[PDB]
Amino acid sequence: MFSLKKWNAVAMWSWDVECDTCAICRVQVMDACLRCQAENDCVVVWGECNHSFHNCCMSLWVKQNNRCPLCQQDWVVQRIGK
Amino acid sequence: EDKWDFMRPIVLKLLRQESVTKQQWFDLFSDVHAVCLWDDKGPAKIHQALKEDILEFIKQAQARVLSHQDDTALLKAYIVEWRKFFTQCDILPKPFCQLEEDSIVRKLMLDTWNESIFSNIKNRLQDSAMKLVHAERLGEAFDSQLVIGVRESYVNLCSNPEDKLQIYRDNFEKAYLDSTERFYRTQAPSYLQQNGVQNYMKYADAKLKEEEKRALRYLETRRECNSVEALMECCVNALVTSFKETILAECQGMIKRNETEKLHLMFSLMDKVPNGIEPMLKDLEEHIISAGLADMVAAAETITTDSEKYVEQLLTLFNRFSKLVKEAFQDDPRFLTARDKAYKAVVNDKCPELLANYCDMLLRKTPLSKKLTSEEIEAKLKEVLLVLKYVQNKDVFMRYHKAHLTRRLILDISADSEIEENMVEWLREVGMPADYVNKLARMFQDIKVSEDLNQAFKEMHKALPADSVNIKILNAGAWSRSSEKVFVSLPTELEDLIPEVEEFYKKNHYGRKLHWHHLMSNGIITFKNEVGQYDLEVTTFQLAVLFAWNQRPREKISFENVKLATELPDAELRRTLWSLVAFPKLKRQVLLYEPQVNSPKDFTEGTLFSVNQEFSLIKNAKVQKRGKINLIGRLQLTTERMREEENEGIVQLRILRTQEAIIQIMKMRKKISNAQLQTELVEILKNMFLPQKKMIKEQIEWLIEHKYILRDESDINTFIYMA
Amino acid sequence: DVFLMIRRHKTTIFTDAKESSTVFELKRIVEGILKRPPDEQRLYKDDQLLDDGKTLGECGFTSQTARPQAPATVGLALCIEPFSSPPELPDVMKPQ
Amino acid sequence: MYVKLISSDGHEFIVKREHALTSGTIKAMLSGPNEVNFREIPSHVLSKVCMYFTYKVRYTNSSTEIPEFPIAPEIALELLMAANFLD
Amino acid sequence: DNDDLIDNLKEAQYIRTERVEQAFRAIDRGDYYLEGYRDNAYKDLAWKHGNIHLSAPCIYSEVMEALKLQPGLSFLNLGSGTGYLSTMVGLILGPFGINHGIELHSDVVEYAKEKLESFIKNSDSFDKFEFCEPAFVVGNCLQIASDSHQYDRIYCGAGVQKDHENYMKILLKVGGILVMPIEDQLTQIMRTGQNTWESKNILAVSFAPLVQPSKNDNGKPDSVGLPPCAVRNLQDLARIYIRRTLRNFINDEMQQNLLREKIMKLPLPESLKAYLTYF
């Protein structure tokens, strides 16, 4: 009696150019970005410009680097926390 | 030279303002012509005969003035006698020409009065007229026309056609200017020590306003000196300025004590003088800083997480001095500014982050929005707006508010669609940038995207059958709230379901890359136990925990064993189990445990759990035989922990946001002084983080010590940007 | 303007006229200065008829011929009392 | 709106208040308690008085030059006496 | 000394006429001075007293000569004082010339009227000559309004600052003469064309300065202008033709005015002031 009756398949999406390759990781595109690990987690948050940003670095460094390190665009600030 | 045997009948009757025919006065012009044409002395006697006939009238007028003994009869008799005489000073001296306006006969009329009899009459006119106002100022109902008539007389007694500052200026103007100032300076002691400052100011203001009304009566308003203004200057200096130091001394008392009735006159008078209103602005500012911190030094740091307790105590502090201003100063914009500037030193003792958590209680389906009606919810949001207008740390409000808006929309847990939309105008009334104002519109569009992506899969792919799968693909910020990217073991029905959803979007919707959170996905599992049937609607973490339970609900499993069965770390299993063993406001729990705990942290690797064999949906405290129970609770939200994890960010923002503004300002301000930087910071930080200089000074300097901003080799207070 | 009198019998009314104006305009110029409308009244030029109005050819109202020292005469059959000379004798001191 | 100036010969000279009120006494009279009677001034004198009034007002706003106003030798004596009732 | 320059101006034949001397014979010195002295017209000293700004001797004498004053021209006097020059220049230009004076104070203009009446009443030379009665207005001579016109012969009776000299230079018509004691430098300013000017020195003088405008944010500045350009009164009109009538007759009969004026069929109370200087 371990069968399921319903599942809400909850996830987020983020902008990129294509879903076959990854410029910020070396892993499946659906996992955490490796740039925050191998190139030093990948907490990816949405902004007003409709390009996500890494919220474990902007929470400290947005004062100097108000960009989206995981995209190709500058960041327009909306959320700086959880 | 005293021989107007034919013309006195007209001149003497006019001098007394008797009825005289218009023709007779007109004919007088041809009679004085006849006098200079048909006489022996005409050309020489006309102006001397005028003097002698005037002199006789003037002496008679003196008797008809000075013979009176009362102040009213003495003053009025002169006024009547003069008004008759002066009226004719523009009529009788029209004829009588070519005898040397500026005629000799007019000069003789005006000068004969002043030289012959005014040498003694003017001291009694001033003494009586001064006594009138001296008594009138005490409430004696004197005839105000007596000092008006003297005013009219003395401005008319001036005979110089080029410089009329004479009889009136000396025998009246100064006497009233000096005597009224002395009167009020010597009257003030009757109130200075006998009553309160409020009641003194009532006397000072009442006497000044009444004297102003009198000033426009007895002080020539068109005089070449504006005596009225000069009087008001000496009167307000006699009444208010001589008391200003004590009027201000009790401003700290009245303000600190919230004596809003006694500040009524305080505002009316002190708001008129920059050197009185400003001390009061600093007195309110300083008392708010001292009184505010006396309460906030505890409230801010001992309440921490209770948003209703903090904000109501912050509103208690806010209302204590906002009520003071709203009453004492009629909601004044300068005392609100002094209030707002004061709180910038207070409310950061570390920040009013709970204003946004309190808003979320007002904006989310919480008891605060269930026990209040729509007007009360909007009223409380307006009260927060009045608070937020002064708060120095505003990005912590947006930090929480925007995180809360995101989670409210994606979970469909908002108090109302209209309440969410009202925050768009609410933030525009605050004055926040569009980047934050329109977050609701951005989330609304993102909800549509999720629904369109959901149907895109459900209508094409049909792992768990698609009829039991509901996909929700939100913006990156919807779920990316933690670094703990934990993924949990699941039965085949779910384990082989996500890869298909992922591959669908990889090829059917290029670019939109998914990222999954097993803390957020949820589902339904059917159970039977020893009392009835039930369906658990729980998160995917909980589904994996239930999977361990599904085939063995009566077998005791250790915390360590669940960790191994589900592949969860301590943090997620402690939170996951809590929602099953200690769910809030639940009559019967799903999972049982033997140890006593206080919180999720107290679950140890040796802790044993089991499934509650009496669990089911409970209605009115009655056990049901079938039903669906949702135990997701706060797992899809942010628990109290949110403050513990965000507190570090709140501290970081206390420096970050200022230095963000500085770096941005310095990019566009290549070389500026600290005073220019702080000036720019006020404008940039107004919607983020604008403390008092007691924090800024260090924050601008720290960018020098840590080698972020360059400074002038010859001026440590001028910052230089490079590149 | 040009000195112009409106005269009849023993009444002399001191008015003016504009050099560039027609007799019809002058009826309104005189009306303006005198407040007497042209109630079936025609303006003259030193007794010149000037038609019944609205004419220019005869309206020789040049200020050089109608200066303040020398008024133009307007007959309000005309009858105007002239100004007589002083009926004075040499009287020794003023030979004539 | 004119002031009527009565000559001793019974002749009536009608001069506008603007035209008459160009000197002192004429302003001094009447301006208080038009008609002005010159019982001593014949019409052959008062005519030049009235024409001088019209002359004065018409040139009260002149530019540079002011024309001469010729007077007959037999009336100047009485014009001066009239002047002492008007100037 | 400055005598050589004054002689050079005379030797240059700039005056030529005797009209200037006639004004000095016709107008009695001192009858324009203050009653407390009635003497300084005959002495060289400080002539400024109270509001009286005249200087009958060398100072005004050179002004009368500095202006050629062809008869019939229009005279403008800014700083007219009591009318000393305005009357005597009016005599030089003809009894029926144009003489429009302005002075700073109404006390001295009021006195100027007293002096003109006193001269006609009690002077010694009145009954011999024709005279021009000048007009006055009161106002600040340095505040010239856009309603000003042009004049032929112009004099300033009080000290002028060089930086403001244009307030009257602009008022001179081509071919005229403007004389001003500019910072106590008395100069002869001539306009020879539309934009061509020439000037000569006259005399080193001593004047009381005009009161420099200091008003702001109101309608005093440049709102005084020149005296009303208007026809004079009737007493002066008739009085001049009375003197012409008698003078023109005796010019032929000589081929005493005091006695002749006694037989005019006019009462003595009038003739005594009007003609006879009270004998």
mmCIF file of C-alpha atoms in Angstrom, chain B residues 124-353:
data_model
loop_
_atom_site.group_PDB
_atom_site.id
_atom_site.type_symbol
_atom_site.label_atom_id
_atom_site.label_comp_id
_atom_site.label_asym_id
_atom_site.label_seq_id
_atom_site.Cartn_x
_atom_site.Cartn_y
_atom_site.Cartn_z
ATOM 1 C CA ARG B 124 -3.485 116.505 27.295
ATOM 2 C CA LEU B 125 -4.439 114.810 24.016
ATOM 3 C CA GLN B 126 -1.509 112.425 24.398
ATOM 4 C CA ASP B 127 -2.065 111.905 28.134
ATOM 5 C CA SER B 128 -5.783 111.196 27.687
ATOM 6 C CA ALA B 129 -5.282 109.158 24.512
ATOM 7 C CA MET B 130 -2.531 107.137 26.176
ATOM 8 C CA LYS B 131 -4.629 106.588 29.298
ATOM 9 C CA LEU B 132 -7.448 105.392 27.041
ATOM 10 C CA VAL B 133 -5.428 102.518 25.575
ATOM 11 C CA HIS B 134 -3.750 101.818 28.910
ATOM 12 C CA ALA B 135 -7.210 101.197 30.348
ATOM 13 C CA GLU B 136 -8.667 99.708 27.168
ATOM 14 C CA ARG B 137 -5.930 97.074 27.143
ATOM 15 C CA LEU B 138 -7.302 96.051 30.557
ATOM 16 C CA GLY B 139 -10.835 95.512 29.222
ATOM 17 C CA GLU B 140 -12.334 98.992 29.695
ATOM 18 C CA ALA B 141 -14.828 99.676 26.897
ATOM 19 C CA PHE B 142 -13.564 103.064 25.780
ATOM 20 C CA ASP B 143 -14.722 104.810 22.614
ATOM 21 C CA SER B 144 -12.075 103.733 20.106
ATOM 22 C CA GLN B 145 -12.884 106.734 17.905
ATOM 23 C CA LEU B 146 -11.079 108.962 20.415
ATOM 24 C CA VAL B 147 -7.638 107.574 19.544
ATOM 25 C CA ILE B 148 -8.642 107.253 15.879
ATOM 26 C CA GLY B 149 -9.560 110.931 15.824
ATOM 27 C CA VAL B 150 -6.275 111.884 17.447
ATOM 28 C CA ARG B 151 -4.501 109.696 14.906
ATOM 29 C CA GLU B 152 -6.428 111.451 12.153
ATOM 30 C CA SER B 153 -5.714 114.818 13.740
ATOM 31 C CA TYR B 154 -1.984 114.412 14.231
ATOM 32 C CA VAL B 155 -1.388 113.136 10.679
ATOM 33 C CA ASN B 156 -3.394 116.175 9.524
ATOM 34 C CA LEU B 157 -1.760 118.614 11.935
ATOM 35 C CA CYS B 158 1.498 118.079 10.022
ATOM 36 C CA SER B 159 1.696 121.138 7.774
ATOM 37 C CA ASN B 160 4.866 120.270 5.875
ATOM 38 C CA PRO B 161 3.701 119.226 2.387
ATOM 39 C CA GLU B 162 6.931 117.366 1.629
ATOM 40 C CA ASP B 163 7.792 115.560 4.880
ATOM 41 C CA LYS B 164 4.686 114.784 7.014
ATOM 42 C CA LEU B 165 6.613 112.815 9.712
ATOM 43 C CA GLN B 166 6.236 115.544 12.410
ATOM 44 C CA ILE B 167 3.357 116.236 14.894
ATOM 45 C CA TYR B 168 2.060 112.626 14.524
ATOM 46 C CA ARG B 169 5.556 111.039 14.477
ATOM 47 C CA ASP B 170 6.664 112.771 17.739
ATOM 48 C CA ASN B 171 3.481 113.667 19.711
ATOM 49 C CA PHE B 172 1.876 110.237 18.996
ATOM 50 C CA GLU B 173 3.719 107.489 17.032
ATOM 51 C CA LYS B 174 6.777 107.160 19.355
ATOM 52 C CA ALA B 175 4.735 107.705 22.541
ATOM 53 C CA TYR B 176 2.554 104.705 21.685
ATOM 54 C CA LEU B 177 5.489 102.584 20.440
ATOM 55 C CA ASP B 178 7.474 103.199 23.656
ATOM 56 C CA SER B 179 4.514 103.145 26.046
ATOM 57 C CA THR B 180 2.915 99.982 24.649
ATOM 58 C CA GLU B 181 6.214 98.102 24.833
ATOM 59 C CA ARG B 182 6.700 99.330 28.404
ATOM 60 C CA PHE B 183 3.063 98.546 29.181
ATOM 61 C CA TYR B 184 3.419 94.971 27.952
ATOM 62 C CA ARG B 185 6.879 94.531 29.487
ATOM 63 C CA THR B 186 5.492 95.802 32.797
ATOM 64 C CA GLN B 187 2.197 93.931 32.389
ATOM 65 C CA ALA B 188 3.856 90.567 31.698
ATOM 66 C CA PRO B 189 4.967 90.196 35.366
ATOM 67 C CA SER B 190 1.265 89.833 36.207
ATOM 68 C CA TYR B 191 1.317 86.552 34.246
ATOM 69 C CA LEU B 192 4.988 85.517 34.116
ATOM 70 C CA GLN B 193 5.043 83.829 37.545
ATOM 71 C CA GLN B 194 1.315 83.455 38.288
ATOM 72 C CA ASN B 195 0.318 80.793 35.752
ATOM 73 C CA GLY B 196 1.598 78.274 33.230
ATOM 74 C CA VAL B 197 3.335 79.122 29.983
ATOM 75 C CA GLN B 198 0.352 77.931 27.934
ATOM 76 C CA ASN B 199 -1.876 80.311 29.893
ATOM 77 C CA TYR B 200 0.700 83.093 29.697
ATOM 78 C CA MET B 201 0.870 82.609 25.922
ATOM 79 C CA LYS B 202 -2.927 82.842 25.849
ATOM 80 C CA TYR B 203 -2.521 86.289 27.419
ATOM 81 C CA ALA B 204 0.464 87.164 25.225
ATOM 82 C CA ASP B 205 -1.379 86.104 22.068
ATOM 83 C CA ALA B 206 -4.739 87.595 23.064
ATOM 84 C CA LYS B 207 -3.182 90.954 23.940
ATOM 85 C CA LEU B 208 -1.029 91.002 20.804
ATOM 86 C CA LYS B 209 -3.960 90.176 18.523
ATOM 87 C CA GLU B 210 -6.186 92.770 20.201
ATOM 88 C CA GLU B 211 -3.409 95.349 19.936
ATOM 89 C CA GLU B 212 -3.037 94.545 16.232
ATOM 90 C CA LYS B 213 -6.721 95.328 15.717
ATOM 91 C CA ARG B 214 -6.199 98.538 17.684
ATOM 92 C CA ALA B 215 -2.969 99.264 15.793
ATOM 93 C CA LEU B 216 -4.903 99.466 12.539
ATOM 94 C CA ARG B 217 -7.246 101.947 14.238
ATOM 95 C CA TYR B 218 -4.979 104.408 16.052
ATOM 96 C CA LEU B 219 -1.711 103.967 14.106
ATOM 97 C CA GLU B 220 -1.894 105.531 10.588
ATOM 98 C CA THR B 221 -1.606 102.338 8.467
ATOM 99 C CA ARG B 222 -0.386 104.422 5.488
ATOM 100 C CA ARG B 223 2.166 106.308 7.680
ATOM 101 C CA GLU B 224 5.710 106.595 6.190
ATOM 102 C CA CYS B 225 6.897 104.075 8.866
ATOM 103 C CA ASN B 226 4.134 101.389 9.073
ATOM 104 C CA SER B 227 3.870 102.206 12.827
ATOM 105 C CA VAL B 228 1.470 99.199 13.089
ATOM 106 C CA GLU B 229 4.326 96.800 12.114
ATOM 107 C CA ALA B 230 6.818 98.621 14.412
ATOM 108 C CA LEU B 231 4.247 98.346 17.253
ATOM 109 C CA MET B 232 3.676 94.617 16.650
ATOM 110 C CA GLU B 233 7.449 94.106 16.722
ATOM 111 C CA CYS B 234 7.789 95.779 20.117
ATOM 112 C CA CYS B 235 4.583 94.169 21.397
ATOM 113 C CA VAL B 236 5.586 90.615 20.462
ATOM 114 C CA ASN B 237 9.056 91.327 21.831
ATOM 115 C CA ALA B 238 7.523 92.661 25.049
ATOM 116 C CA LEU B 239 5.105 89.734 25.400
ATOM 117 C CA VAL B 240 6.755 86.720 23.724
ATOM 118 C CA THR B 241 10.470 87.369 23.195
ATOM 119 C CA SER B 242 10.979 88.511 26.794
ATOM 120 C CA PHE B 243 9.429 85.137 27.711
ATOM 121 C CA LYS B 244 10.826 83.121 24.787
ATOM 122 C CA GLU B 245 13.559 81.395 26.799
ATOM 123 C CA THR B 246 10.975 80.103 29.288
ATOM 124 C CA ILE B 247 8.449 79.454 26.517
ATOM 125 C CA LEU B 248 11.111 77.233 24.952
ATOM 126 C CA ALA B 249 12.297 75.897 28.327
ATOM 127 C CA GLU B 250 8.827 74.385 28.860
ATOM 128 C CA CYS B 251 8.706 73.016 25.305
ATOM 129 C CA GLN B 252 10.877 70.111 26.455
ATOM 130 C CA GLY B 253 8.539 69.644 29.409
ATOM 131 C CA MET B 254 5.305 69.912 27.433
ATOM 132 C CA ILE B 255 6.643 67.759 24.584
ATOM 133 C CA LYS B 256 8.283 65.110 26.774
ATOM 134 C CA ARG B 257 5.136 64.952 28.924
ATOM 135 C CA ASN B 258 2.851 64.859 25.850
ATOM 136 C CA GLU B 259 0.892 67.882 27.094
ATOM 137 C CA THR B 260 -0.825 68.454 23.767
ATOM 138 C CA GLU B 261 -3.264 71.005 25.201
ATOM 139 C CA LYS B 262 -0.454 73.196 26.547
ATOM 140 C CA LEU B 263 1.344 73.033 23.190
ATOM 141 C CA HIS B 264 -1.662 74.637 21.474
ATOM 142 C CA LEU B 265 -0.407 78.199 21.905
ATOM 143 C CA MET B 266 3.176 76.936 21.870
ATOM 144 C CA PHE B 267 2.691 75.969 18.219
ATOM 145 C CA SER B 268 0.694 79.063 17.288
ATOM 146 C CA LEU B 269 3.447 81.368 18.525
ATOM 147 C CA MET B 270 6.652 79.380 18.095
ATOM 148 C CA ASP B 271 5.889 78.258 14.541
ATOM 149 C CA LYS B 272 6.080 81.945 13.594
ATOM 150 C CA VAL B 273 9.717 82.387 14.656
ATOM 151 C CA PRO B 274 12.513 80.244 13.134
ATOM 152 C CA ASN B 275 14.475 80.538 16.406
ATOM 153 C CA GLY B 276 11.547 79.089 18.349
ATOM 154 C CA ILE B 277 10.195 76.382 16.034
ATOM 155 C CA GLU B 278 13.630 74.892 15.393
ATOM 156 C CA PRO B 279 14.490 74.394 19.103
ATOM 157 C CA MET B 280 11.109 72.661 19.401
ATOM 158 C CA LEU B 281 11.945 70.435 16.425
ATOM 159 C CA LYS B 282 15.206 69.492 18.144
ATOM 160 C CA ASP B 283 13.453 69.136 21.506
ATOM 161 C CA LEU B 284 10.927 66.720 20.014
ATOM 162 C CA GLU B 285 13.738 65.027 18.089
ATOM 163 C CA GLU B 286 15.894 64.532 21.184
ATOM 164 C CA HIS B 287 13.032 63.408 23.431
ATOM 165 C CA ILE B 288 11.885 60.855 20.857
ATOM 166 C CA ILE B 289 15.446 59.528 20.613
ATOM 167 C CA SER B 290 15.760 59.204 24.396
ATOM 168 C CA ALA B 291 12.195 58.055 25.079
ATOM 169 C CA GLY B 292 12.124 55.792 22.039
ATOM 170 C CA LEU B 293 15.332 53.930 22.878
ATOM 171 C CA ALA B 294 14.178 53.531 26.497
ATOM 172 C CA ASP B 295 11.499 51.188 25.112
ATOM 173 C CA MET B 296 13.064 49.984 21.851
ATOM 174 C CA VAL B 297 16.361 48.887 23.407
ATOM 175 C CA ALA B 298 14.317 46.061 24.910
ATOM 176 C CA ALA B 299 11.422 45.713 22.467
ATOM 177 C CA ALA B 300 13.530 45.401 19.314
ATOM 178 C CA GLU B 301 15.878 42.708 20.668
ATOM 179 C CA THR B 302 13.647 40.821 23.127
ATOM 180 C CA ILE B 303 10.621 40.425 20.830
ATOM 181 C CA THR B 304 12.663 39.400 17.775
ATOM 182 C CA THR B 305 10.065 37.279 15.960
ATOM 183 C CA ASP B 306 6.592 38.294 17.240
ATOM 184 C CA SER B 307 5.523 40.727 14.540
ATOM 185 C CA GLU B 308 2.229 41.750 16.167
ATOM 186 C CA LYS B 309 3.778 42.429 19.581
ATOM 187 C CA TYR B 310 6.710 44.397 18.148
ATOM 188 C CA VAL B 311 4.753 46.520 15.672
ATOM 189 C CA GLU B 312 1.999 47.287 18.188
ATOM 190 C CA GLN B 313 4.688 48.382 20.653
ATOM 191 C CA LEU B 314 6.378 50.266 17.817
ATOM 192 C CA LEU B 315 2.992 51.789 16.995
ATOM 193 C CA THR B 316 2.636 52.551 20.706
ATOM 194 C CA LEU B 317 5.917 54.468 20.553
ATOM 195 C CA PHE B 318 4.980 55.851 17.137
ATOM 196 C CA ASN B 319 1.485 56.854 18.263
ATOM 197 C CA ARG B 320 2.770 58.277 21.555
ATOM 198 C CA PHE B 321 4.646 60.974 19.650
ATOM 199 C CA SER B 322 2.487 60.905 16.511
ATOM 200 C CA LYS B 323 -0.557 61.564 18.692
ATOM 201 C CA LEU B 324 1.503 64.327 20.307
ATOM 202 C CA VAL B 325 2.124 65.875 16.885
ATOM 203 C CA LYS B 326 -1.308 65.053 15.447
ATOM 204 C CA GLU B 327 -2.872 66.832 18.430
ATOM 205 C CA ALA B 328 -0.354 69.403 19.670
ATOM 206 C CA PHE B 329 0.761 70.537 16.198
ATOM 207 C CA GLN B 330 -2.236 69.517 14.045
ATOM 208 C CA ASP B 331 -0.234 66.751 12.341
ATOM 209 C CA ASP B 332 2.518 69.236 11.557
ATOM 210 C CA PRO B 333 4.857 68.476 8.608
ATOM 211 C CA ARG B 334 7.938 69.820 10.420
ATOM 212 C CA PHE B 335 7.351 68.041 13.728
ATOM 213 C CA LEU B 336 6.540 64.900 11.752
ATOM 214 C CA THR B 337 9.929 65.472 10.107
ATOM 215 C CA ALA B 338 11.585 66.024 13.487
ATOM 216 C CA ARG B 339 9.731 62.906 14.646
ATOM 217 C CA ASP B 340 10.850 60.990 11.556
ATOM 218 C CA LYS B 341 14.461 62.147 11.905
ATOM 219 C CA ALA B 342 14.443 61.166 15.585
ATOM 220 C CA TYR B 343 13.237 57.623 14.889
ATOM 221 C CA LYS B 344 16.049 57.128 12.374
ATOM 222 C CA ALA B 345 18.228 57.029 15.496
ATOM 223 C CA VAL B 346 15.851 54.729 17.412
ATOM 224 C CA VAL B 347 14.054 52.097 15.338
ATOM 225 C CA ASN B 348 17.376 50.617 14.160
ATOM 226 C CA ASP B 349 18.146 49.471 17.720
ATOM 227 C CA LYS B 350 18.469 46.007 14.838
ATOM 228 C CA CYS B 351 15.727 47.062 12.419
ATOM 229 C CA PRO B 352 11.893 47.044 12.140
ATOM 230 C CA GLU B 353 11.893 43.989 9.886
#
